[PDB]
Amino acid sequence: NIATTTKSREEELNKRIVNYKIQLKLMKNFLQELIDR
Amino acid sequence: REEELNKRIVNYKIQLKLMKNFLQELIDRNN
Amino acid sequence: HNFEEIKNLIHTTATNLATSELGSDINDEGDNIFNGSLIRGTFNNNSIFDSKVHKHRTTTYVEGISTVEQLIQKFLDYSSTLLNDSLLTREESLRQLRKM
Amino acid sequence: QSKILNTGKYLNIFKRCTGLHNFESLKEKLTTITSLAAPDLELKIDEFYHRANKMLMKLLFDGYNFPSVVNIFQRLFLFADSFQIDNFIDSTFSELKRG
Amino acid sequence: TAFTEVVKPYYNIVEHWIVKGELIDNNNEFFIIFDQEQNEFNSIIKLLPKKIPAFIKSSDKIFQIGKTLIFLNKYCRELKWVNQYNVKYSAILFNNHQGLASMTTNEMIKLIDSQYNEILTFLTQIIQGNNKLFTHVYNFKRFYFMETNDFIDAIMVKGKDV
Known part of the structure; x- marks a missing residue:
């Protein structure tokens, strides 16, 4: 089994995913502003 | 269980890279 | 509670830079090595050591923030902490908060 | 690669912000990379990157007053001073609750 | 006459290894080699006592200079x-x-000895200096070998339910 540690593993992964969801959506909004012109 | 989160992380890495490549393609073509 | 850390760090960095001159002088020797340093060819076998080592160990924020990349990273981590701590990151917590 | 790219970008930001055409006013002594086969290429890149960070950091903190921008963002976004937003809600209470 | 130019490249390999600390020979023609498969520093580099040439001196010091x-x-x-x-x-x-x-054996040995002393002096000044090896070994003994019994009593009393 994977070692347990004081730092929350799933919390770190979840925060990474949320930060990757902000970058994606901001990039999509920028591309929409770029394409429509 | 956390394998699934890692898999989604890498999928979003690829999607972000694709979006950036799309930006570069669009800018290259407009120039 | 989270903002106290950033406030302390930024105050320390401001005090550190206040006493620091602008522009740094870089000196070098005559570098007579020539053939003792060229190492021409395909490459050396020392490339393996660069990959073997890891640089994931950086902490203690000594002397405040020293690189703009850490300056941005600190605030990104702070914002991620604010979102995660609040009841908006999970689906169960967000659904219960919305109902309440 | 990251160090080279970021050193160049940071110097470009400094020049475009403070308006300097080149860093003559600072009158600093600099050493250039003598050759691609030199042994101190990594050291030279590290030194240049540290110089660029030093300049851009001092610009942001001392010149652009970033520390106060952090408190301003705290107040405006997270209500570290809630008096003004309380007045705002009180003044437009009837409107905000409408569809 | 031919041996001078034939041996110069070997001395160039030794020069690069001694001064900067890097390995040049892609082919197996030197008494120092690497092991990419290994996963620890002290054993990635190993010596080959069979391939040590007769005209080289203080080989066991060359190896340590390069490794350090x-x-x-x-x-x-x-x-x-x-x-x-x-x-x-x-x-x-x-x-x-x-x-x-272009160095007589006496001067070559003296140069290698000077390099060895300087290198190990600086290695000490880092490892037992800035790193404080003795302090961290003492802390290893303090925590792993149970010495600070108060801390462990605190852990056990606090975690008696967890």
């Missing part, structure tokens, strides 16, 4: 002093003399 150089310039990342050392001893190999070939 690799360790310093790739793990401790102390590039400043490594560069200063490189300049200092290149000014002896290539300016005072014309390379390892």
Whole structure:
């Protein structure tokens, strides 16, 4: 089994995913502003 | 269980890279 | 509670830079090595050591923030902490908060 | 690669912000990379990157007053001073609750 | 006459290994090699006692000089002093003399001895200096070997339910 540690593993992964969801959506909004012109 | 989160992380890495490549393609073509 | 850390760090960095001159002088020797340093060819076998080592160990924020990349990273981590701590990151917590 | 790219970008930001055409006013002594086969290429890149960070950091903190921008963002976004937003809600209470 | 130019490349390999601490020979023609498959520093580099040439001297010191150089310039990342050392001893190999070939055995041994003393002096000044090896070994003994019994009593009383 994977070692347990004081730092929350799933919390770190979840925060990474949320930060990757902000970058994606901001990039999509920028591309929409770029394409429509 | 956390394998699934890692898999989604890498999928979003690829999607972000694709979006950036799309930006570069669009800018290259407009120039 | 989270903002106290950033406030302390930024105050320390401001005090550190206040006493620091602008522009740094870089000196070098005559570098007579020539053939003792060229190492021409395909490459050396020392490339393996660069990959073997890891640089994931950086902490203690000594002397405040020293690189703009850490300056941005600190605030990104702070914002991620604010979102995660609040009841908006999970689906169960967000659904219960919305109902309440 | 990251160090080279970021050193160049940071110097470009400094020049475009403070308006300097080149860093003559600072009158600093600099050493250039003598050759691609030199042994101190990594050291030279590290030194240049540290110089660029030093300049851009001092610009942001001392010149652009970033520390106060952090408190301003705290107040405006997270209500570290809630008096003004309380007045705002009180003044437009009837409107905000409408569809 | 032919042996001088035939042996010069071997001395160039030794020069690169001694001064900067890097391995040049892609083919198996040197008494120092690497092991990429290994996963620990002390055993990635190994010596080959069978391939040590007769005309080389203080080989067991050359190996240590090169290993400590690799360790310093790739793990401790102390590039400043490594560069200063490189300049200092290149000014002896290539300016005072014309390379390892143009050096009598007595002077070559003396040069290697000086490099060895300097390198180990700096290795001590880092490892038992800035790193404080003894203090961390003491802390290892303090915590792993149960010495601070109060801390462990606190852990057990606090975690008696967890």
